[PDB]
Design a binder for these strands. Structure first.
Ligand SMILES: O=C1c2ccc(O)c(O)c2C(=O)N1Cc1cccc(Cl)c1F
Ligand SMILES: O=C1c2ccc(O)c(O)c2C(=O)N1Cc1cccc(Cl)c1F
Ligand SMILES: [Mg+2]
Ligand SMILES: [Mg+2]
Ligand SMILES: [Mg+2]
Ligand SMILES: [Mg+2]
Ligand SMILES: [Zn+2]
Ligand SMILES: [Zn+2]
Lengths: 184, 368, 368, 184
DNA sequence: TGCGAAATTCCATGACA
DNA sequence: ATTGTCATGGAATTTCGCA
DNA sequence: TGCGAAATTCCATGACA
DNA sequence: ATTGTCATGGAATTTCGCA
């Protein structure tokens, strides 16, 4: 059996609803299975339509052999299937209630949820503008298991923005205090 | 003047008037019987006025001015005086064309890595599609990989929106652009400093300097045209298609598509190359590092048989940018301060500013 | 198709499939182990579809299309099929650029006599001077002698007014013009038939064909610009001055001014040549007849290393005149009916008309 | 003494008033002394101004060494002198009441007067349009004394409009009849 | 170690408001 | 303070298949 | 029958909405 | 049924003045 490559499998998921930012409520999350490279797209809903609009941007840069997802409505719709068939993309579903990805991906998805939370406090409304900087962060993060960042595995070079401070990612006592108060 | 010619009439030899000719007087004027005929020899104090009246008839150059003068006059070294006048005629110097070509073009080294250098530019106005009139084109120098964004104007603001989306993927060391309004604004400068991106500008009115992206503009319009044949020019929806189509097109000289130069492996697009199916990603990546360094690089072509190359301190003239009807195509002479490279100079310009300028927008001032 | 490949799998030799390679079956498909790797050999009945999908990705030419196909397939003589498709892609044929230059330019003989042939043309719009915006320029082919008339429009009517005044001096055998609205009107045709003047037209969109007058336009604008430096562009009053100035300017290669070629003696202008002061007018006139026949005539330059020349019955395409944004720059293929000379042809055009057209507005249709 | 050349001497004169044609009343007549080439300019008056305007057209084609004229007002004005001096043209006057030209010129001037008259009958009002055809006629007329037409002497070639019918120039009995009636 | 044909490489031409 | 580029399709040159 | 300098001729470059 | 042209100013080549 042949080694794993970038574009072999994209893992997609919705995060939200979030506080509205510039009119947007959700984040479509796409993570490349081999590299752990993350792309994020803000949407107004977890609909097939918003998914399609967003994946059309990504798939005009690179097209995955397989998309993997949970059995979300947006992903199991027959429009979404027609879309994928058109692009020769095989669709792949985890069984309901039993979400499986891969350790690398799970850990990645975890980092995303945590890093989001850390920045939507203080400014729960300004996250739209920060999605770029979040991705750079996530993609220039060192991977314990591989010797490399997703940036490096995707492009085979160092990056002009290394994130040399493998960071806190944890909430300071101030943020626990005004997040345990704002969410009440 | 009259001392010299007096001294001459009495048959004594003056340097410059060959001895074998007979120099008489007649009608109050010094004459000489030259093989072409009898010509008047004016006094030296008259010569500049004569050369000037002859030149002024139609602001003629060397020979055509000389031929008028020779009709009536002769004196030693006529062309030296004609040329002295041509070098002082403001009107001729700023209106005439050059007749010396530029030195041969440079072929700057390809960027070493993806994201080392972006070339960006606008195409448009296009026929309105969904309220959009322009396209921002972003071309990675090393790979050729290209991003397209439809805008409503070629503004700083639409540039910033688009590049915020693009730079989600990666931040480039350098962004090269021409001097369009959208790129030279202080807002855009800030936007780039904020990110440690260096802004690099083409010399003015010299799109060849953005050659990398301009050339991609051609491919973009050419594919857009073919796809639109016999349909109304609804291009907005095709940008994505064109982007992907071009990023995955082979360059016959390189034998690689821009996508391959960027990722070292094809994605799920038609006719994906499968030659590295058995390598590990890491084996693949070091084959890509090898492929990247060994790409064909062109060389500086032969100079044309009559080119010029700028020398420090030379008088040169910058081409007027958008010259009005019936107005000179050249600026007043100015001086080469620094030779940045053999196709690029700094000059002390037509006001009193320093300008970095392409040799293609210059002529060497004639007659020195 | 399947007959051929069946016949092949059992190890018997088919013309075009070299014997030294092993042709197996796998995943339901015929394959072969070529040095580049394992490639699928599709049945012949599949090939056109494949070549077409590959070409269609970005409407690529020969090599760039081939490189896609080679990623997955092999078969005998792939490029022949690729080229067959390129020659049938309407979209590519009318959008792509040519990469063959025109054959070298003709240098038509100089008219033998003054008034044998006039070249006429308009310059403008200019900045309004006294309500005038254009200049009619009339250039005698043989002599270069030029007449200027300020008009309010480049109309048939203003042409006729001006030429009635000019032709008071003499009637020309031929008047050559480009295809401007003012010259092609039925009124102007009548005006010329009325006088036994033959009208001769440039091929369309090819100002080089009016080279004689176009070149004089340059001198006219150039002298006008110099005279107007640092003044407002009040040109109307300078036409007379410019006319006379140019008619009396030497051509360095000829050693004669147009006035001299026309009259054989200078008038009372500055620096008049006086060499024939002692000849009778008749002696003068036969010296002029001699001078007229012995003028320098240039020759057809070397062809460029990749020019083409039209052959009767060839497929060729006429350049679209004013092509809309994002629309093809070429018309559909058409056929060379007659080769008028090596730079001029008659073609059976894009509708069904005959058109006389310059080779510069044509490309040879690619792939035949 | 040196042989006679074209441009050595232009002989100028006014003819008129004539019936108004397209607003014009007079004809300035210029005849080259050596060749007998004729130029004609319609004017609104025999003024220095109209002369200058008209000669500016001609002198932008060729400039005579000398202009000869009678002592007409237009020609003896100091403006006309200033004009000529500016162009290095010597002015030359016949003594009052004793008009002398040269035989060639006199004969030419005669032809002009007669040919005009012959065409201003029947259409005394349409002469403006005919001035071109009159000049061609006059300039392609064979000269008894020289073997040549003015066209030929001026340009040293044959003309594309030869006037092979050395013509009547005399009034038919019809024209004497409706000219001896219209001028009454 | 040499032939005829296919395949590959060369490279002038032209277009990027 | 910056700098031309590269798809294209005939032609020229090299390589392939076979002996 | 020969030299140094002036004069002439050559000719690539570029512009004619 | 029509077709490039020619001023320009350095450089290349020729001719001139003298011996
Ligand atoms: O003339 C411009 C121009 C002017 C100003 C711009 O901002 C700009 O983008 C362009 C532009 O693309 N071109 C087209 C072009 C003409 C000739 C040669 C080349 Cl390489 C070329 F690209
Ligand atoms: O493009 C035009 C044109 C179009 C239509 C006309 O009616 C006309 O007179 C002209 C015209 O003079 N030019 C200028 C020009 C451009 C390129 C080469 C040459 Cl020789 C040249 F003259
Ligand atoms: Mg631009
Ligand atoms: Mg551009
Ligand atoms: Mg025209
Ligand atoms: Mg023109
Ligand atoms: Zn001047
Ligand atoms: Zn095509």
């Amino acid at each position: 059996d042949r080694p794993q490559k970038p574009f072999d499998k994209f893992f997609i998921d919705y995060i939200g609803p979030l506080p509205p930012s510039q009119g947007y409520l959700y984040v479509l999350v796409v993570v490349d299975g081999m590299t752990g490279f993350t792309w994020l797209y803000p949407t107004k809903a977890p609909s097939t339509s918003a998914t399609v609009k967003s994946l059309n941007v990504l798939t005009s840069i690179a097209i995955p052999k397989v998309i993997h997802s949970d059995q979300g409505a947006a992903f199991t719709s027959s429009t979404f299937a027609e879309w994928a068939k058109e692009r020769g993309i095989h669709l792949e579903f985890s069984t309901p209630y039993h979400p499986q990805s891969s350790g690398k991906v799970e850990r990645k998805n975890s980092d995303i949820k945590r890093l989001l939370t850390k920045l939507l406090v203080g400014r729960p409304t300004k996250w739209y503008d920060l999605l770029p900087v979040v991705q750079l962060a996530l993609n220039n993060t060192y991977s314990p298991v591989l010797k490399y960042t997703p940036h490096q595995l995707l492009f085979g070079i160092d990056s002009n923005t290394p994130f040399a401070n493998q960071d806190t990612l944890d909430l300071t006592r101030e943020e626990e205090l005004s997040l345990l108060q704002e969410i009440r | 003047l009259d001392a010299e010619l007096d001294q001459l009439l009495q048959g004594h030899y003056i340097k410059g008037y060959p001895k074998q000719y007979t120099y008489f007087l007649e009608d109050g004027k010094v004459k000489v019987s030259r093989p072409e005929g009898v010509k008047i020899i004016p006094p030296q104090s008259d010569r500049q006025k004569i050369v000037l009246q002859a030149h002024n008839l139609a602001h003629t150059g060397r020979e055509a001015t000389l031929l008028k003068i020779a009709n009536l006059y002769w004196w030693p070294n006529m062309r030296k005086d004609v040329v002295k006048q041509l070098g002082r005629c403001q009107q001729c110097l700023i209106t005439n064309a050059s007749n010396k070509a530029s030195g041969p073009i440079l072929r700057p080294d390809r960027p070493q890595k993806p994201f080392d250098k972006f070339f960006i530019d606008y195409i448009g106005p296009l026929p309105p599609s969904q309220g959009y009139l322009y396209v921002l084109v972003v071309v990675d120098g090393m790979t050729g990989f290209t991003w397209l964004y439809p805008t409503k104007a070629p503004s700083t603001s639409a540039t910033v929106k688009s590049l915020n989306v693009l730079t989600s993927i990666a931040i480039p060391k350098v962004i090269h652009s021409d001097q369009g309004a959208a790129f030279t604004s202080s807002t855009f400068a800030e936007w780039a400093k904020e990110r440690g991106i260096h802004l690099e500008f083409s010399t003015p009115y010299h799109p060849q300097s953005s050659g990398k992206v301009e050339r991609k503009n051609s491919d973009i319009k050419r594919l857009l045209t073919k796809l639109l044949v016999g349909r109304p020019t609804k291009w907005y929806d095709l940008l994505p298609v064109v982007q992907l189509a071009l990023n995955n097109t082979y360059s016959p000289v390189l034998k690689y598509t821009p996508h391959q130069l960027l990722f070292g492996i094809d994605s799920n697009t038609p006719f994906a190359n499968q030659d590295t199916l058995d390598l590990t990603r890491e084996e693949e990546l070091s084959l890509l590092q090898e492929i990247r360094t060994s790409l064909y690089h062109p060389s500086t072509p032969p100079a044309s048989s009559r080119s010029w190359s700028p020398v420090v301190g030379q008088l040169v003239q910058e081409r007027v940018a958008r010259p009005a009807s019936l107005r000179p195509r050249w600026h007043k002479p100015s001086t080469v301060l620094k030779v940045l490279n053999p196709r690029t100079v700094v000059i002390l310009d037509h006001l009193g500013n320093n300008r970095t300028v392409s040799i293609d927008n210059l002529k060497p001032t004639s007659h020195q």
